[PDB]
Design a binder for these strands. Structure first.
Ligand SMILES: [Mg+2]
Ligand SMILES: [Mg+2]
Ligand SMILES: [Mg+2]
Lengths: 434, 232, 87, 141, 297, 137, 165, 323, 142
RNA sequence: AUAUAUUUAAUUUUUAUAAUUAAUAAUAAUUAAUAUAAGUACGCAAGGAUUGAUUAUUGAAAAAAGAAAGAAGAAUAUAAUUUA
């Protein structure tokens, strides 16, 4: 595909909101630094510029400073304040002792994804009443297959992950040889994910669906439906009738006489040809539901792909000037999800291994928000309550009866279904049809 | 518990509708003689006055079974304490002819409708702002700063609506008489014939009805809306 | 995380050299003192930009910069705090 | 010439339809339906068309500032047993309004209950004729 | 259970947050089709370069003073304000993000010198409650005993930073007396030194003081003595501002006022109680002049 | 091939040869029996104030080959229960949520008694980023 | 052919009024039952019923696009096509043919799929007359109002309506 | 362990106000701890009290030089902290009021800045601090009414008959360690201070550094401003006859005293008395600021005593500002 | 809920798989019953061999099935062979069902009532022990 | 009303694996409904702004390294749903 058309001006891109605070390299002197500006001085940091060891190299108006009381006092007070009030100068602790490599970094760490299979389509309703036509994808056997890094350069390290275990007689001889040299089980398809060296996983690592979190945003890549050779009315319809969008020289006023016409078909001209069967990518699709027993992930969107298509799933690094993985929203399973040793998915049921996302909307999309509706009835007793300043607690008269009521409530709340099921099973096993 | 205006509540309510006919709602104890008399009376088969006999019988059975109330149970009802508080606020503002109507049983969007008569746009806006400040505890928005209509103001307070009008516009609308004359909702009303404005070769529909409300006044419509549907 | 009061109010981006001190009682704006004195809120925006080419000279201590002695050795000025080329 | 519309990469050309026996799709659908049932968004149903169509349905839709309460007969059903794609076609006629609703199952805001417990095919035919006449009448002429 | 703020609570209050995933508005991701290869979660780190990550193997770039290969050339400002190893790419190639390989070496922080080990220093609490014109704001913050001049008689070290003020008048509160010796006869050629000293005497008579006549004195030297000024402070120390060729009355006032600030700092360190600066009739007259200037322009 | 195409076709092998010649100096050490990884200096000067008195931070990250090999070879630890059970939040809470309603003063209309802990509307609108020294959300 | 040098389309102002969608395979209107955002808006010269107690019976739409999705942010002017005749004789009765009022849309015959998945096919196209201040000329509404009516843009319309769906 | 304890005591600052247990216990009483140029010193004294936990429920650092905490006539409000007693579990709600000022800002800030730019002497600041003792109903925890009555008759204080001895001794120790035992008082002491200020206003007043002017005001506090601020304090201390005292003091009050009376009536909650004061106030900057003090509908509702004829109509704000 | 990226029944390529998206699609008639299948290039339909019209195609199919039942085999060409094999399977299914409706349907389809009778006589006992695939198709090298 | 040449849009059929560069479709001078800043700032007064949010307008795109004369379905959507 690769586009290369005229484009649609409905989507209003806004790059002016996408520029950080401008900074010039020349403005990186000691008068602009937020912290005490330090000089390299070889093996030890210093507060003064380096003095040339040859006195002949000294400039006529250059001042070789060996002790500046202003800088000394400021640096001393700064260091002593940071040492004596850690909780008060906590934000200044990133100046020295930086976060070490290997740990997850909010602005640096990117991890690999997985390879799913478009399984089926369903419809699910949220708590607000919004319906979502969801596509359920299946992740049969995800496993790190290979590591790659061209010429050992920086930022060129990636990991190749396989999708589906297949027999030996399934692939071509060279693909079978690739998997033999890799030493991992022979997979059906394999996708490469560019990562950072702190997000590596050993070759052969089982990748669980819980690698993703039920509420995050993902980038998916698949192959759309093939429609064959179609016409200009089918693909980019209502266009291609005449040569449009041509910016050439012409006269705006009758003052002069000069024009430059068209003598060929310019590249990008919309005409008939192949339609579909192209690698299509969706960006920022939220995750809806994760079934980690059947290895299923639900996306609230419908695809233009066929059932059985291998879809590459990765994570969207940022959205609207904000990082996906952060302390406010949440942190990922970095580098990948590792199950606990005590877990046994064979003993769990399908209805148990389900993870749902928080609501993706703020109001019933059928109606309007509360600020736009004419009138509404606000009945939210268990959802939330913005009414602060709780009333004073009731004066207790007997700690004995108070603790009795509290323990009774705790015992009636705990083991509401598990104990009931265990008692029912014990009764069914002890009755023996009597 | 406190109401929407932070007022204690001492009067309970019914979660069902008053117009309902449910065995669970009926508290009178049955009698063998009454049952025998009712059986001897029903021994003579006679259809209901509604158009769809099957549908009318099924709807009456559903009503006396009470599943309609189990489906229409709504605990989001308003409170009369808020109506009384708005009444006191409007009385302090000296708003004449305060008329409150409960239309929870009737087909509407609000539980209570208040109607007040104010003399002038200044007084109308003052009363609207005072109702807003009385609802300041739970309100999410304020009223319009610029009056788009100098004779009518609408203030929503939960499921309670407040209309502030002048004498002329109030007498012209006559919404209080409308909502008073309007009978409560009856599930047997949907058993009538459908109506649709369509001119046929003889001005008669085989399965539908044709009624023109242009020749009828507002009060005539308010009084005969259900009457015409029940007759034809 | 949760809502924290630390993120409510923004702090000044003053530099280290232009700062007076790192004390918590001097972390606030410098004009706030006169604002409190005058009992009025000042909302003057964009006070001044640095320059197109902001260049500065090395400042010496308040007493040294005026009581520097004319002490010289072979071809260089000598001070308890500075060295420099002398002709 | 300067672009390409198709992709012949193995990852995209390959399909996984042959390995679908390792995935119980129908069981997952039934599990979703049972989850909806136990959460209370839908109730399990099993009927045929001849015994479902024509039954009055009481539908309460939670809408501000007051839920809308309608009574309308079943005109068609899309699934016999309970399913996440169950569907229900209902004709509801108010005092002067006639509408044809298609209520999906499992929505927490759209609580519809079938009450007749029986079919009433003759009532279905009557409501069908009423809706047809009303629909042909409503067009402006 | 403890309660916290949430999106539902803020909605009930009346505020809705912006949509993150499901929205028909732009999601502000300029790198989806422009940046190729590996992209880092830091947003907009390549927008000033032109929204691309190509041509990163380059070493030298077009750069002004203080950027790039300027380190090999001498500039008076940057030679003392920038380390020759902290020179990066200049222009639009500013490094908002940098990634390198190898073992990171974190050099030890600098050490405060001329501080004896085992010395407990005095800590000065600086706050905005103290007026900025007070020398305490300019005094050292971490002050040791090895920095206190005891030969002068000080209990604390002297201030290291001086106020940056262009002095246009004299403040004779911390000055015991001012004697100005001039020659009676006027030099044949235009004597800028004599003119400047006469202007200095005029401004000292008009200086800021309740009665500057009690402290300013003029003398004539028939011995052809060069015109000079002698300021005796409250402690008895004398200062003689050198009046050289080209110096103006404003320059002499600046010198005298800077030395007066230094002398008052010495007094305060020795323990002398000095009268503070405040509002007076001279300041009211200066306010009249200031209003005149403001009304003019 | 165009001008830039020909230039890159000729020079990319030469760039890789230059990188090999650079790594030759690093391999010089390993042949001496003493292997020392590349030693890059830490940057203590990554916090700045621009011309418009705005805070700027330079993010410099250094990759450790030893940690990279450790992650390539060893197995990652078990995921945290809260990490894999708690869902990712779909909305971003404002740093300074405007409340507009506080039950502290006896008379709610009195503006001069509102507590200063509650953020103002200007704060609610302008605080779209952590405070000046802070860098993480 | 203006401009003389590079002639352009003379429908530049019509493009600012119409809501069009290129009929490719990815962009299609379809029927309203496909989902949310699949109903074709009402074009111009479309007849609607007038259910308020006014002299008018039918109106003709002037708007190039009219739908429920943007009934809260767009103004719909219309002209009174047919007016009821009163053989035996206020502001609502003074409605004369040819006059231009605004219209609040209540229902449509085309399929409308809500975001909750509830499709609806009303009996007939419906609207009520309003002035430039969005105050209905009638005192009562003889039909059902759609859910989109529940918006502050239609305050008086919601007040005068007695049934919503 | 110590690091976590310190960080919890620090995050006590970041704790929110809406979720603070301010009304956790039924009974409450108010006390005035004096006026402080720098109330942060008194706050540090309260923080370092042996009878209170080092981890408070809520802490607010009072920084008068912050753009959101600059004290004005219509000041930012109240900085609030909440401490817990160790032995009785009572609550101390410390309230630093930054809105008690009754001095108008300078008309021309440039002249005031030129005047006070190089001055090396600044006047004191009068910023009030109050404490609300919150305690539950107790019969044997306060040591009976006689113990507190003995404490009151010994130290000239006004404590309730059931206030916990823990909180009583905590307040006493804090005030004595800070050195404001004379400033620590209650309703009776505030009434005595108000009588003293009335006598001082009757007596001739000494000349300050320079007379006040709408252009360049004098930062030093005068007797009338002190009287207004102390009327505000007496209203804050929950005086039962505060409305009667304001009504009796209004006819003989100056402009700052009337501004203080307006603020005091607004604190007490008498909207009718506040509207009466605003309508009786002659037009000027004082009336403009006392109108800006509150959240209103229209300024004429407060300013106009009699209804001003607007478009042959008359508005009435008595129902809006009654009760 | 929203709509798929491509709404409505859109004709895809010959070898394109299913989409499995909510789409209101109707069948011409019940093609699940034997001899009532539809012809097309999707996978749910029989490969439509070349004919002037669907009526002509059905006539060719009827004569093919008639001769198939007549002489137990048939040499056909092109896309007619899969259709003939599937229709022979359908005929065997109808014969094994042996209902009066099945008799009448095979009589409606076939051109020879004697061949209808021959099928219903022979095929049940012939394929009683077979589940499916009653006909064998062999591609010839000529 | 013509594909003859040029030029374009496609294709040369699993290529385990987009990305070191060439070239190339979306660089805000938006519009309308609400609500909040606020019934604030600003006005003699009646009055009354600026303003980052939701809808409204419904879309998503990766180039070249493997063995080739059937239907890429043994065809009635299963990689053989029993099978003589
Ligand atoms: Mg909506
Ligand atoms: Mg009409
Ligand atoms: Mg090939």
């Amino acid at each position: 595909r690769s586009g290369s058309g005229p484009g649609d001006k409905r989507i209003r891109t806004d790059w002016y909101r996408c520029y950080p605070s401008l900074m010039r390299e020349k403005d990186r002197d000691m008068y602009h630094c937020y912290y005490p500006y330090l000089f390299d001085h070889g093996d030890k940091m210093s507060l003064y510029p380096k003095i040339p060891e040859n006195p002949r190299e000294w400039q006529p108006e250059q001042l070789q400073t060996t002790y500046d009381a202003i800088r000394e006092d400021k640096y001393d007070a700064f260091i002593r304040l940071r040492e004596k009030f850690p909780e008060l100068y906590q934000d200044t602790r990133a100046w020295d002792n930086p976060p070490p490599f290997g740990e997850f970094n909010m602005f640096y760490s990117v991890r690999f994804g997985m390879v799913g299979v478009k399984a089926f389509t369903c419809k699910d309703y949220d708590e607000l009443g919004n319906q979502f036509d969801c596509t359920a994808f299946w992740f049969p056997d995800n496993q790190v297959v290979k590591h790659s890094t061209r010429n050992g350069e920086v930022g060129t390290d990636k990991v190749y992950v396989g999708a589906m275990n297949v027999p030996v007689e399934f692939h071509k001889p060279h693909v079978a040889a690739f998997y033999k040299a890799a030493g991992v089980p022979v997979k059906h398809v394999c996708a490469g994910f560019p990562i950072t060296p702190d997000a590596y996983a050993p070759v052969g690592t089982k990748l669980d669906v819980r690698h993703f979190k039920p509420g995050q945003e993902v980038t998916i890549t698949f192959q759309n439906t093939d429609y064959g050779f179609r016409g200009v009315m089918f693909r980019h319809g209502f266009d291609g009738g005449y040569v449009w969008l041509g910016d050439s020289r012409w006269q705006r006023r009758p003052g002069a006489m000069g024009t430059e016409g068209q003598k060929r078909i310019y590249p990008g001209h919309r005409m008939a040809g192949q339609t579909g069967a192209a690698a299509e990518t969706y960006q920022g699709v939220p995750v809806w539901r994760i079934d980690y027993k059947n290895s299923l992930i639900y996306l609230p969107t419908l695809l233009d792909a066929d059932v059985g298509t291998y879809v590459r799933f990765s994570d969207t690094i940022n959205t609207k000037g904000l990082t996906l993985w952060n302390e406010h929203r949440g942190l990922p399973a970095f580098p990948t999800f590792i199950p606990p040793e005590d877990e046994d998915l064979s003993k769990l049921a399908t209805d148990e291994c389900q993870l749902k996302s928080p609501p993706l909307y703020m109001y019933f999309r059928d109606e309007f928000p509360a600020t736009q509706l004419v009138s509404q009835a606000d009945v939210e007793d268990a959802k939330s309550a913005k009414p602060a300043t709780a009333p004073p607690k009731k004066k207790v008269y007997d700690m004995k009866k108070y603790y009795e009521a509290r323990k009774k409530y705790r015992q009636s709340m705990q083991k509401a279904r598990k104990y009931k099921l265990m008692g029912l099973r014990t009764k069914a096993h002890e009755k023996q049809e009597e | 518990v406190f109401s929407r205006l932070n007022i204690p509540i001492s009067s309970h309510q019914e979660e069902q509708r008053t117009n309902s006919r449910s065995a669970l709602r009926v508290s009178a104890s049955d009698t063998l003689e009454e049952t025998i008399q009712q059986p001897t009376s029903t021994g003579s088969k006679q259809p209901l006055p509604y158009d769809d006999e099957r549908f009318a019988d099924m709807l009456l059975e559903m009503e006396v079974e009470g599943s309609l109330d189990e489906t229409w149970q709504d605990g989001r009802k308003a409170y009369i304490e808020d109506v009384k508080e708005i009444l006191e606020v409007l009385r302090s503002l000296k708003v004449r002819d305060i008329c409150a109507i409960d239309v929870s049983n009737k087909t509407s969007n609000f539980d209570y409708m208040l109607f007040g008569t104010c003399e002038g746009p200044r007084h109308i806006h003052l009363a609207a702002w005072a109702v807003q400040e009385a609802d300041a505890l739970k309100r999410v928005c304020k009223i319009r700063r610029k009056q788009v209509d100098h004779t009518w103001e609408v203030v929503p307070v939960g499921r309670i609506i407040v209309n502030l009008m002048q004498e002329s516009l109030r007498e012209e609308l006559s919404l209080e008489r409308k909502w008073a004359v309007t009978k409560c909702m009856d599930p047997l009303s949907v058993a009538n014939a459908p109506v649709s404005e369509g001119r046929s070769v003889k001005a008669h529909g085989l399965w539908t009805l044709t009624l023109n409300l242009q020749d009828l006044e507002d009060f005539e419509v308010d009084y005969c809306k259900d009457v015409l549907l029940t007759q034809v | 995380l949760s809502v924290r009061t630390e993120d409510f109010f923004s702090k000044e981006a003053i530099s280290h050299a232009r700062r007076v001190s790192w004390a918590p009682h001097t972390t606030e704006k410098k004009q706030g003192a006169f604002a409190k004195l005058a009992r009025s809120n000042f909302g003057d925006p964009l006070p001044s930009s640095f320059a197109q080419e902001p260049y500065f000279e090395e400042e010496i201590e308040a007493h040294r910069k005026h009581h520097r002695p004319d002490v010289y050795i072979y071809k260089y000025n000598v001070s308890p705090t500075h060295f420099s080329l002398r002709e | 010439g300067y672009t390409r519309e198709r992709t012949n990469r193995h990852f995209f050309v390959a399909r996984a339809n042959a390995f679908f026996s390792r995935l119980p799709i129908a069981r997952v659908q039934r599990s979703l339906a049972m989850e909806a049932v136990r959460e209370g968004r839908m109730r399990p149903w099993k009927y045929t068309k001849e015994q479902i169509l024509g039954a009055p349905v009481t539908c309460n839709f939670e809408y501000n500032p007051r839920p809308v309460r309608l009574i309308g007969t079943v005109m068609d059903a899309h699934t016999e047993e309970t399913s996440i794609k169950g569907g229900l076609k209902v004709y509801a006629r108010n005092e002067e309004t006639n509408m044809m609703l298609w209520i999906p199952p499992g929505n927490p805001k759209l609580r519809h209950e079938v009450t007749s417990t029986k079919g009433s095919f003759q009532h279905y035919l009557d409501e069908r004729d009423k809706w047809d006449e009303a629909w042909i009448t409503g067009r402006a002429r | 259970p403890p309660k916290h703020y949430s999106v539902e609570s803020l909605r009930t209050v009346g505020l809705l947050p912006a949509q993150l995933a499901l929205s028909r508005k732009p999601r502000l991701r300029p790198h989806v089709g422009n940046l190729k290869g590996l992209v880092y979660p830091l947003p907009y780190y390549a927008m000033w370069r032109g929204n691309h990550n190509k041509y990163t193997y380059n070493k030298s770039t077009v750069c002004l003073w203080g950027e790039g290969d300027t380190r090999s050339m001498y500039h008076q400002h940057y030679a003392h304000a920038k380390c020759p190893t902290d020179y990066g790419r200049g222009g639009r190639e500013f490094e908002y993000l940098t990634v390198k390989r190898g073992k990171m070496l974190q050099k030890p922080l600098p050490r405060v010198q001329y501080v004896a080990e085992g010395s407990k220093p005095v800590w000065l609490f600086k706050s905005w409650h103290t007026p900025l014109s007070s020398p305490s704001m300019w005094e050292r913050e971490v002050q040791y005993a090895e920095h206190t001049p005891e030969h002068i008689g000080a209990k604390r070290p002297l201030a290291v930073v001086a106020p940056r003020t262009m002095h246009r008048y004299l403040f004779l509160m911390h000055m015991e007396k001012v004697t100005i010796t001039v020659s009676p006869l006027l030099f044949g050629y235009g004597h800028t030194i004599q003119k400047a000293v006469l202007d200095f005497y005029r401004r000292a008579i008009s200086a800021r003081s309740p009665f500057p006549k009690d402290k300013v004195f003029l003398f004539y030297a028939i011995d052809h003595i060069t015109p000079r000024i002698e300021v005796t402070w409250l402690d008895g120390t004398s200062y003689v501002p050198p009046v050289l060729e080209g110096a103006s009355s404003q320059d002499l006032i600046q010198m005298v006022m800077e030395e007066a600030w230094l002398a008052a700092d010495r007094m305060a360190a020795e323990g002398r109680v000095l009268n503070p600066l405040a509002i007076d009739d001279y300041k009211w007259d200066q306010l009249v002049v200031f209003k005149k200037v403001r009304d003019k322009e | 091939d165009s001008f830039k195409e020909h230039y890159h076709r000729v020079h990319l092998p030469r760039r890789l040869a230059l990188q090999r010649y650079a790594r030759q100096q690093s391999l010089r050490n390993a042949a001496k029996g003493n292997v020392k990884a590349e030693e890059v200096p830490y940057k203590y000067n990554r916090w700045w104030v621009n011309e418009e008195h705005e805070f700027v931070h330079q993010y410099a990250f250094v990759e450790d080959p030893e940690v990279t090999k450790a992650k390539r070879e060893t197995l990652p630890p078990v995921t945290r229960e809260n990490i894999w059970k708690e869902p990712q939040q779909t909305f971003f809470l404002p740093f300074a949520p405007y409340v507009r309603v506080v039950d502290y003063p006896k008379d709610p209309d009195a503006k001069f008694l509102k507590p200063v802990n509650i953020p103002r509307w200007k704060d609610y609108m302008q605080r779209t980023k952590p405070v000046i020294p802070r860098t993480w959300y | 052919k203006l401009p003389a040098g590079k002639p352009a389309n003379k429908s530049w102002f019509r493009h600012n009024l119409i809501i069009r969608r290129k009929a490719s395979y990815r962009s299609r209107w379809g029927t309203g039952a496909e989902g949310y955002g699949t109903g074709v808006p009402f074009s111009d010269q479309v007849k609607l019923h007038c259910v308020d107690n006014t002299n008018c019976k039918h109106v003709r739409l002037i708007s190039k696009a009219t739908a429920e999705r943007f009934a809260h942010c767009r103004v719909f002017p219309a002209v009174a096509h047919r007016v009821s005749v009163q053989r035996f004789k206020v502001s609502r009765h003074r409605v004369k043919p040819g006059n231009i009022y605004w219209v609040c849309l209540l229902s449509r015959r085309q399929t409308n799929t809500r975001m909750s998945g509830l499709r609806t096919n009303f009996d007939r196209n419906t609207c009520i007359l309003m002035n430039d201040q969005r105050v209905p000329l009638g005192t009562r509404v003889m039909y059902c109002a759609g859910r989109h009516v529940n918006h502050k843009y239609h305050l008086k319309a919601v007040v005068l309506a007695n049934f919503f769906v | 362990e110590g690091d976590i304890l310190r960080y919890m005591a620090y995050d006590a600052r970041n704790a929110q106000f809406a979720f603070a247990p301010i009304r956790e216990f039924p009974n409450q009483q108010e006390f005035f701890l004096g006026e402080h140029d720098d109330p942060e010193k008194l706050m540090e004294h309260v923080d370092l009290c042996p009878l209170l936990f080092a981890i408070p429920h809520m802490r607010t650092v009072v920084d008068l030089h912050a753009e959101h905490m600059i004290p004005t006539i219509a000041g930012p409000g109240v900085a609030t902290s909440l401490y817990r007693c160790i032995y009785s579990k009572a609550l101390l709600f410390v309230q630093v009021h930054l809105s008690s000022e009754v001095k108008l800002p300078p008309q021309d800030p440039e002249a005031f800045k030129f005047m006070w730019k190089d001055s090396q002497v600044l006047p004191k600041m009068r910023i009030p601090v109050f404490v609300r003792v919150v305690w539950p109903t107790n019969e044997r925890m306060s040591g009976g009414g006689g113990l507190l009555r003995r404490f009151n008759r010994l130290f000239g204080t006004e404590f309730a008959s059931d206030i916990p001895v823990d909180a009583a001794m905590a307040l006493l120790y804090v005030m004595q360690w800070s050195g404001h035992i004379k400033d620590f008082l209650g309703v009776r002491g505030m009434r005595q201070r108000l009588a003293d200020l009335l006598l001082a206003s009757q007596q001739p007043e000494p000349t300050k550094l320079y007379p006040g002017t709408r252009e360049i005001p004098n930062p030093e506090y005068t007797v009338a401003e002190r009287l207004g601020m102390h009327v505000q304090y007496l209203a804050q201390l929950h005086d039962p006859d505060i409305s009667l005292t304001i009504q009796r003091l209004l006819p003989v009050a100056s402009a700052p005293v009337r501004m203080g009376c307006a603020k005091a009536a607004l604190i007490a909650g008498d909207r009718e008395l506040f509207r009466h004061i605003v309508s009786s106030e002659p037009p000027g900057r004082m009336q403009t600021y006392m109108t800006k003090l509150v959240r209103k509908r229209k300024t004429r509702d407060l300013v106009d005593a009699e209804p001003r004829l607007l478009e042959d109509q008359y508005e009435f704000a008595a129902p809006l500002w009654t009760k | 809920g929203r709509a798929p990226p491509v709404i409505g029944c859109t004709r895809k390529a010959r070898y394109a798989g299913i989409d499995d998206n909510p789409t209101i699609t109707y069948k011409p008639w019940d093609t699940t019953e034997p001899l009532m299948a539809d012809y097309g290039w999707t996978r749910g339909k029989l490969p439509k061999f070349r004919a002037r019209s669907p009526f002509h195609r059905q006539q060719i199919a009827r004569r093919m099935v008639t001769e198939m039942i007549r002489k137990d085999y048939c040499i056909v060409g092109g896309a007619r062979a899969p259709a003939l094999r599937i229709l022979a399977d359908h005929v065997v299914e109808l014969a094994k069902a042996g209902d009066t409706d099945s008799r009448q349907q095979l009589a409606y389809f076939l051109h020879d009532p004697l061949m209808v009778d021959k099928a219903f006589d022979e095929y049940p006992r012939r394929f009683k022990d077979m589940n499916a695939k009653y006909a064998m198709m062999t591609r010839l090298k000529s």
